[PDB]
Every structure is written in C-alpha cells, then in structure tokens.
Subunit: 265 residues, 5 copies
C-alpha cells in the first residue's frame, strides 16, 4: 500500500553515483575487473575469465529518522536515473584484418543491459543447448532447460559469477526493479554505442511510483558486451588467430540514481 | 454487439494475468514440442516437423464474473493493455565458429517476431510461397495451394501447436477481436537485434476506447520468435560441409502481462 | 470548391476493405515472377507491375470522402522456399532491391515514365513503355496507372500531379540487401490535407494502387547466389496488400 | 528589421513548384541533365560528365504592387520536397560472384536547400596533393579543412561538384539546407518519398526565407550510389571502368510563400 | 548558488560562432598513415579539437547551441577496391563527439590493453587502467594532444559541461553523416540552468572520425596497401553558442 511522497526538502532527497566496472567473473565473492577477458576460445565451453558476467553494486542509503509512525513507514524511492556507457573507438588496440587490408576494430555479438531495483535482479537460467554447451563450474550453471518454463532454474544476481550468456532477467518477477537489455547477434556485426550527460530515464510506474528501497539499499546491475577483438598489432579475423579472439566490454557503466522519500502502509 | 460503459474500477473489477509462451517446433497438433532450437532444418525443399518453427499458443482462463447477465446485457473482461517481452541471451560458444573470419559465428539469418492477443484464436491465411516446389510434412498444418492472399486462399484459426510460421500469415480481413504485430527480416546472414525490458507497454484499445472483449472467459495469446539460425557449440559453421547442422534459433520464451477491466455489452 | 462534411450518421459513413494481389503483368496474380534473368531486357511475367483496384462505393453534389486508411503487407519468413548458399553453408533467404508503395485516390495514379538507361535497357512490347527520358523533365512521358502492365522499374509517382491521391514509397537498393517487413492491425494513416479534406471520390469509386517487391529468391531446396543458378533468380513480391478505407460524405 | 506578415488573402499568398534535374555539369552556363554520368573511373581525377554537381533553380516571384512605404517581400515559410526514383534491377548489371543482380550501391549524398540567394559553399579538397579536378569544374583550391582560408563561393552555376563543395554554416543566413552523406563502396541506398510530408522553413522568431531579390533559389543533389551497365557484369575488377554514378531522376519542390513587411 | 536571469535586452544576450578544425596533434582532415602496428603515433591518431572563445566583459550563461559536421562524399579521393570492382569510399570505426562547457572537458584515461597497446610520448598517455575505476587517470582536455582512442568524457565530473558522443566499431562499417542549419540543441538542466561561463569564456571540444581511407586513384582494402590506410576526419565542426546573463 503506497501513500504520498514526503514533501521535498534538502533532507528528503538523496542522489548517489556509481561506476560499475566490467566483470569477467572467476569467483562468487570477488569480481575480476577488466574490460577485455581471457581469449574466449572456439570451444564448446564457457571459461572463467573469458565469459562476461553481470556487474553488480549494492549502495546503502541513509537512515531516515522517525521512519515508522502509526501504521506507516517512510522509505527511499528511486524515481529517476541517468546511465551512460564509458567507451572509446578501438583502432590500434584491436588488431588488423589482412583480407580487407585494414584495422579489424570491434565486431560481433553484443549485449547492453542495465537494471536498478530494491533487491538483487531476478534471473532465469537457460542453457541454449543443454546437450552440448558446457559451463566451467566456477560460473553459475544455468541447469538443463533451454526454455523459460516454470521448471527453469531461477536465482538472483547477488554474486560476481553469473554469465550473461546463461542468465536472463526474469519478467515474471523483478516487480521492484526496472531493467532494459539489447542483444545483437552475428560474428562480424558492427557495434554502435552512444553516450552523453543530458539523457535521463524515469523509473516510475503507471501510478507514479518508483523503486521502493524497503531493504535500505539500491541495487544496480549491468552488462555491456561491445563485441570481440583481436590483440594490438597482430592479425585477427582469420583462422590462425581465432585462439586470440577476446570479448570486449565497456570500460564501465555510470549510474546516477535520484531518490525521494515515500510513505507506505 | 453494442459496447456500453466500463464498470467502475475497483479491486474486483480489474485483473491482470501473466504467461510465458514457450517455443514450439510442432510435431503434432495437441502436444507442443517446447525447445528453443529445432532439429537441423536441412537444405532441402521440405519443411519437417521438429525443424520448422510453429506458432506458440496459450489460452488463459480469466476469473468468473458473478451476476454478469441482465436481460440483453452482460459484463465481460476487457483486455485494454499488455506488456510483452522476448527472453533471449547473446549466443557465443553456443553457436559455433566460422573459419573464414576466424571468429564466433553467432546467430544470423531470417527472422520473425510476432505476437497476438485476442478473445479467441488468431485468424490466419495459408500461403505456400511456391505451391509446385515447396513441400510440407503431413504432421504440419498444410496451407493449401495459393501463393497469394486471395479470397480463395485457405483460412484457419491457430488452435493447435503445428502451424508453421513459414506457411500461415495473420489475416487482416478478420481478427476483429485480436490485436497483432509482426516483423520479418530476410537474408541468410542478417544479424538479429532483440530488445527487452519491463517498462514498455502496448495499448489494445481501438479508436472508440474498446479493448479485446474476452467474451468466452479466456484470453488467447499467440507468438512466434525466430531469431535466426545457428550452428552447434564448439564446431565449424557457415561453410558448405556443415550446412546439414544449421538449426533454427528461437526465443527462449515470450512473456505477456495482460491487463483487464470489466465492460458491459448489449 | 469543397464545402462542409455531411453530418455523421450510419448512412453517411462507409468503409471498405480490399486485398490487392501481386501482379507480374503480361498485358493491359502470382507472388513470384518468372525468372528475371541477368540480361538487359525486362520481360512480361518477370517484372513486377503495379497492382490496381477500383472499388465501387455506394450511390448517394455530395461525394464520398476517404479520410483515413489502414494498410498492411502480407508476408511470411522465407526459409526452405528460397534455397541455400553454399559459400556460407546456410539458407539464402530473400535479399536484394526492394520497393514498398501504396496509393489511395479518387482516380488512377499519375506517373512519370523513366528509362534509367535509354540506350541500353530494353523493355518487352507487352509492358507499358516509359519513353526515352532518364530524367523527370517536362518531356518525360506522363500516364495514369489504369491497367495491369505498368512496371515499377519504369514508372514513378508524379509529384506535380496526384492532387487527389495520397501515396508513399520506399526503395532499397543493392543485390544482397536484407529486407525488413512489418505488419499489424493497429496502425492507421490519415488522408486529410492542411484544410481537413481527404480524397474526394468524384467518380463514385476509390482507386487503390500498390507494389511490394521484397527482393529476389532462388527456388526451394536448391543452390542459389552463385553464377550457375543466376538464370533461376526470381522476384519475390508480397502475398498481398490489405487496405481498409474509411469514407464520409462531403458536399462539393 | 522583420515586422508583421501581411494579412492573408488570395493575393498575399503564392506557391510554386519545380523539378530540379540531375546535373553532371560539363560547363558553367548550361547543365548536363542526365541521371547517370559518364564512367567515373578508378582514377585520381574527377572527370567532367562523371562527377555529380549541384542542381540549381532560380524561380522569379510575382511583383507585389505598392510594395514600398518599410517594404513588402515574399517570405517562403514551408516547402515540400521529394526525390523521384525507381528500383534499379535489369538496369544495373549483375554480380557474377553472387549470381544475382548488382543493384545500386555505394557512397551517397542527399541534399536540398532553399534560400533568398545562391547557396554559400566552402571549397575543400580532401587530399590537395593527390586528388585532381578537371578544369571545366569549379576547383576548390588547396585547403583540406574548413578554415577561414578555405575558398568560399556561391553555387551560381552548373559545374560545382558535390565531392568538393560543402554548404557553409558560417553563412547561409537566408537559406535553409539539409544534407546526408553515406560512405562505403557497397552500401545499400534507402530512398523514401510521398506526397504527405512537409518541411517548415521558419526560424526561432517565426520568420522564413525572405526573398528580397524577387526570386527563390533552390539547390539540390541526390547521388543514390553507383551502378554498372544493363546486362553486363559489375562489382568485379574487370568491369570497374564502367562503374557510373547513379543520381535521382529529379527532385520535386513545392514552395509556399506569403507576404512579410520589413524595415 | 544560481539566482535569476538578467532581463533580456540587446546588451544581455550574445552569440558566437566557431569552426573547430580536425587535429592529429596541427590541422588536417586526413592523418599520416595510421599503420597496422601496436602503437599510436603523433599525426596518425585523431586527438580532440578544442577552442576557448572569450566572451564580452553576473556571468554569461550558454543555454542553446547549434553544431554541424562539415563533410562531403568521398569518391575518387578514397581509392578503389579490386575485390568489388568499385570505389572503396570511407569505412571503418567512427567517433562523433561534441562538448560545450564553462571550463575544459573532464576526461578519464583508459588504455584498452595496458600490456600491449603503446602510446608515443608526444601524446597524452592515459596511464595503466583498462577500466573506469577511481584509480583511472583523470585529466582535463586543455591541450591539442589528447588521443580520442585513449580519453573518454568523465560522467562523474563535467557538472558545467554538456557533451554527446557516438562510437561505431568494425573495420568496414559505412559511415552516415547528416548536417543542416535548422537543428538546435538546448543546454539547460532540469532547473532551467545552462552552462555558466564563470571564466568569461566558453569552452568547445569536438572529435569527428568518419572512418578510414585509401589514397586517391590507388588500390586499398587489400593487404599490400594496409600501410597507406589513413584516418578520415570531418572537415570541421561548426558551433553557434547562444548566451544570456545570469546572476550567480
């Protein structure tokens, strides 16, 4: 039961910024912050350090004095955010394609994903080919379903080792989270990344209600796979160099989250 | 049917329901074949069951409305808005590698993204794009022999799991109590672009403010999401010798949330 | 001189539907043509022509005014139907040059005839010949699409006329370009001008014209996109183009 | 000083239509109206008849009786413009390697302008040392950058190549223009057209193009890409000496004028 | 503390124009050959362009701007590709960037491969981080030698600068450039406040890499000619900045 916002003052408003760093997770409890992974390989197995995992940040919010009074409590409500991907054009850094006599640049399959909620992101585990695709056991294994059935494995992203190839935001949950993702397929598809500091993203639902941070924190999740790359000053996009193809992630993803106070029953 | 006023909004006169429609490479009418990759599609002239993507359907029962009938009027659920999202992840090791470009192959090729929401099954037109040369296995719903959407082309409703999306098109001359949208992309190496999120919404109301009238007590959902084709994990693809392994890649599922209110009709 | 609309009743409003079928016109319906060839010559049966419908409206100076339409392209993904490309070890699909065009007017569509290469491009006698201009000059041939044999490669909607028609077209070039087709039953298209006046159907009918070339295709289950099979490439059209035209009464 | 519009009557409003034809200029005073050029060549030199030049039209407007008191002038406040073009199939040759029609592809430019005088342009040679320009065409001088020293002219003739002359954003105070460039050698073109779109020409103060010289000046260029010849191979080295620029068939303009008082 | 705008007159409003020229830190629209090496070299790598425009002697508040890229189609200028029997044109990786602020642009230095990507000493080195951590080098673009491959607008700062960038990857990607003199860009924040020019100047920054190119009339997009591939920049980026007065 959501009631009214507390009248706006300096004390009833709070904003916070964070930069989520790319994470080729190798462990649950600690991230591996690097914007390029280990070589991905042309194998049937996702390897730790090679596969891009979700990035997460949990940001504690200030205590609200006299929060509980009568049957109502006051909580922080995140009602708007700005987010931006940090990235530069890749030239000398990404190797050369002999067949086209030029720089290879970044290309291939992509994912651009962000979420903001009052708890960790609900996800579904899907193995696109449960018989043939293998997942190193240091990464969160998605179970045996290739479809998003009631039986598919469900978890929350509370750790550094959830590969983006295996875990999808769960639309049947995430009732107190907003999220947005874009996937691009193909192996040579060019990426297009835009950024700036004038755009903003509202977080309010149809009733004017944002994310209710009833656990005292705001939870951020992201993943930004820009494509694949070769190594600087070496050939790529040729059979002999497939063993060096590497995932290129964004340099980081900036968030600015705006909060106000909201009374709930 | 004359549409009267909405019933005043309360907790009891509004209802929302969720479903996830799973991909189906139909092999039979009454039982779906829920998998997100088919059997190898083949380079042949014949659509085979398990290989060809079929429409997914769900029929979702809505709550009984007590005391709904008065003389010449009744109260029914009206679906006025929906959210729908495709579930999908980037495909990397799962989709093989292309030697010629020394990199992962990923998903590419011909695509279809389709959804429908209505008060009964989706009306479709059967079209064979080449009636003389394109063959269809008898386990699948055969579209008949028209290559054009003439008055004579076969018409059916999608009431089973074995209607291939390659052979059956939403019928714009019918579907007066269904809303639908589809997007087709051609080519054999075309990259897919899929987006999803839980903030977008789709109104279902017509120019008179009237949504889908779920007069039979259920809402009918239909979908198809072919993201492209794929090779097998860790193996070479996009080369002549491995064409017999190319497989259709479907979405993992299609989410719907349907919002309903009550409407009196006369 | 256009005056006021007639007050709205059940009798002063009319809507009609039609599905125009693809036409590879041979003289003045199939969704794939005869093989197109790599040659310098457009053939009847190979080249896509405009589709036309003249739809009679009810007897009622008051005339019917079309103020809004819905239009949708009917099409399915092409997989086994379009053959395979050995070089990429996968299905070929539909690709290449495209045209998506519709018009709605109170008479036939005004067009300009253009031969893009008057010295070298040849046109079979069964098709409506565009004359000898490669530019939309005053001298370029002007006709109306009142028959089934106007090839879309040779006739372009005339923006100096069509004062009582609305039209829209999109051309995509290239030979391997992927097509993108969308359709649904919720979109709609107003037909009214700056002064609130739609199409005035002064002959007692509404005139529809369309062309939907989605690209080229090989034959089912056979190799394509290679030299040996170049003589088998065929134009893929849409299966049909749906129109719903909404009319009211207008005093002239 | 711009004052008020004249109260709208039949006499205080005027609209005019034109179709600007493609021009592969070979001389200054006379256009060369064709929608395909001579073969462009794979050379370091822009050839006359091969390089697309800007198309221009200057349209005289009606005399306004008792215009001076302040003076009344025609103000162009809105226009419609559309490209005339058809799909190119048999006309554009075949790509042997892919066993299909080549169609139109490659580098593109779609440009229009409408103003009260000729378009102001900057001359830029993208490689002053190595790119050569036939002497029948307006040479852009020796700057590869849009500096204060770059050659400046107006498009007052039929021989300004679009590869060498860019609309000048430091001038054109009484012109509106828009351009789109697409690179690459095999990029597919997308052209749309219709008779329902419109383009406003009014600025922040609601003032359009003031036609103080008694005419409206139209400028355009529509390079759709390159093409081979009908029934012949293309997109292969052996036939590269036949690759030709494909222009639009024409560009339609309808320009809407009203009367405006100025001081 | 931001107070009220000063009432509008002829005196309290000011606009200024500039064209920022491409800078391979210095003004040329094609660099030296870029090389297929592991090393960014001076004159081959595109750097940010900068202009500091002094304003007339309360501070000036830039509330609106127009910006456009100057560029022409590249045909004979960009070489020929034998494999497709036609002109190569411009293609490849791209950046289109502009910024307008009351001081220099705040940037973060990032080396995308600290172990292998090398940077010539004449260019501003980004330090050793491949991620935008608190540890990543932080600088302002106040010189002509900041490579756009190494320095990214800092979203954690730039509180008095507006910026926008677009990056396109790949080695053969076609560029699409649009321009015109009717579009405009507001610079005001949610409170109606623009760029406060508290040093009495407006600071402009830009980068426009349209792709790569071969030399005129010569083969390109083939191995033997890779040592001739060169970055193609825009011919210039125009700005018109609109200013009013604001009590501070």
């Amino acid at each position: 039961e959501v009631l009214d916002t507390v009248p706006l003052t300096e004390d009833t408003q709070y904003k916070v910024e964070a930069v989520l760093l790319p994470n080729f997770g190798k462990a649950a409890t600690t991230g591996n912050f690097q914007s390029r992974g280990l070589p991905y390989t042309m194998s049937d197995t996702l390897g730790p350090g090679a596969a891009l995992c979700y990035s997460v940040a949990v940001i504690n919010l200030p205590e609200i004095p006299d929060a509980m009074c009568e049957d109502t409590m006051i909580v922080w409500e995140a009602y708007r955010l700005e987010t931006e991907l940090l990235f530069a054009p890749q030239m000398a850094s990404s190797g050369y394609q002999r067949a086209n006599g030029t720089l290879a640049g970044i290309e291939g399959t992509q994912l651009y994903f962000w979420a903001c909620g009052g708890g960790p992101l609900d996800v579904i585990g899907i193995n696109p080919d449960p018989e043939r695709l293998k997942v190193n056991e240091a990464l969160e294994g998605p179970g045996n379903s290739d479809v998003a059935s009631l039986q598919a494995l469900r978890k929350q992203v509370n750790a550094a080792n959830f590969p983006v190839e295996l875990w999808v935001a769960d639309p049947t949950k995430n009732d107190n989270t907003r999220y947005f993702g874009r996937v691009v397929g193909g192996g040579v598809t060019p990426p297009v990344v835009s950024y700036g500091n004038q755009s903003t993203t509202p977080l309010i639902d149809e009733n004017g209600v944002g994310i209710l941070c009833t656990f005292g924190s705001v939870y951020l999740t992201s993943a930004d796979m820009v494509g694949m790359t070769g190594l600087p000053g070496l050939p790529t996009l040729s059979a002999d160099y497939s063993n060096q193809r590497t995932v290129q992630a964004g340099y980081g993803r900036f968030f600015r989250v705006h909060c106000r106070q909201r009374r709930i029953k």
